[PDB]
A and B are shown apart, each in its own frame.
Chain A
Amino acid sequence: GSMENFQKVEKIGEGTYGVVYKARNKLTGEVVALKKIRLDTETEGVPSTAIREISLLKELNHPNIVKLLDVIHTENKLYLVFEFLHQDLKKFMDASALTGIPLPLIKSYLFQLLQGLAFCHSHRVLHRDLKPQNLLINTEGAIKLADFGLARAFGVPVRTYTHEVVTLWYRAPEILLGCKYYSTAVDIWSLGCIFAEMVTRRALFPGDSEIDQLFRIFRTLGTPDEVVWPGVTSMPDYKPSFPKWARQDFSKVVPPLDEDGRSLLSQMLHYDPNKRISAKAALAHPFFQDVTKPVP
Chain B
Amino acid sequence: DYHEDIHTYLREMEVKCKPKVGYMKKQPDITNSMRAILVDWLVEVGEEYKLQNETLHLAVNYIDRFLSSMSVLRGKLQLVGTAAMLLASKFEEIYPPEVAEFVYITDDTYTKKQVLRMEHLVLKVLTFDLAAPTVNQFLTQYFLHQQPANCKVESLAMFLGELSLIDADPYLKYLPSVIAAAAFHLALYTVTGQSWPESLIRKTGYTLESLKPCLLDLHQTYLKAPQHAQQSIREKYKNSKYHGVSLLNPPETLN
Seen from chain A, the residues whose Cβ lies within 8 Å of a Cβ on chain B are: 39, 41-46, 48, 51-52, 54-56, 58-59, 71, 73, 75, 121-124, 153, 155-157, 159-162, 184, 278, 280
CA distance A162 to B10 in the complex (A): 23
Binary contact track B90-118/A, C-beta < 8 Å → 1, others 0: 11001010110000000000001101100
Given known A-B contacts A46-B120, A46-B123, A157-B140, A71 and B128 have beta carbons under 8 A apart = yes
Pick the interface stretch among B1-9, B43-51, B171-179, B188-196: B1-9
B137 touching A155 by the CB < 8 A rule? Answer: yes
- Judge whether B130 is part of the interface by a CB distance below 8 angstroms: yes
Q: Which residues of A contact B86 (CB under 8 A)?
A: 45
In Å, the complex CA distance between A56 and B123 comes to 14
The contact of A55 among B10, B91, B99, by CB within 8 Å, is B91
Chain A minimum-CB-distance residue to B4: A122
* Range for the number of chain B residues in contact with chain A: 35 or more
Residues in B whose Cβ lies below 8 Å from that of A278: 1-2
B120 near A123 with CB under 8 A, answer no
A48 and B144 form a contact (CB under 8 A): no
Give 4 nearest A-B pairs by CB, closest first: A48-B90, A122-B5, A55-B130, A45-B116
In angstroms, Cα B129 to Cα A51, docked, is: 9
A/B pair count, beta carbons within 8 Å:
80
Asked if A155 and B123 sit within 8 Å, CB to CB, the answer is no
A-B contact pairs, 29 of them (CB 8 A): A41-B116, A42-B116, A45-B86, A45-B116, A45-B120, A46-B119, A51-B87, A55-B129, A73-B124, A75-B120, A121-B5, A122-B2, A122-B6, A122-B9, A123-B6, A123-B9, A124-B2, A124-B6, A124-B10, A153-B91, A153-B131, A155-B140, A156-B3, A156-B6, A157-B140, A159-B52, A162-B94, A184-B2, A280-B2
In the complex with contacts A45-B99, A124-B10, A155-B144 CB distance below 8 A: no
Secondary structure at chain B's binding surface: helix, strand, loop or mixed?
Answer: helix
B167 contact set on A, CB distance < 8 A? none
CA distance A45 to B185 in the complex (A): 41
| B149 CB to nearest A CB, Å | 11
A75 to B5, CA, bound (A): 38
B141 contacts partner chain A, Cβ-Cβ < 8 Å: yes
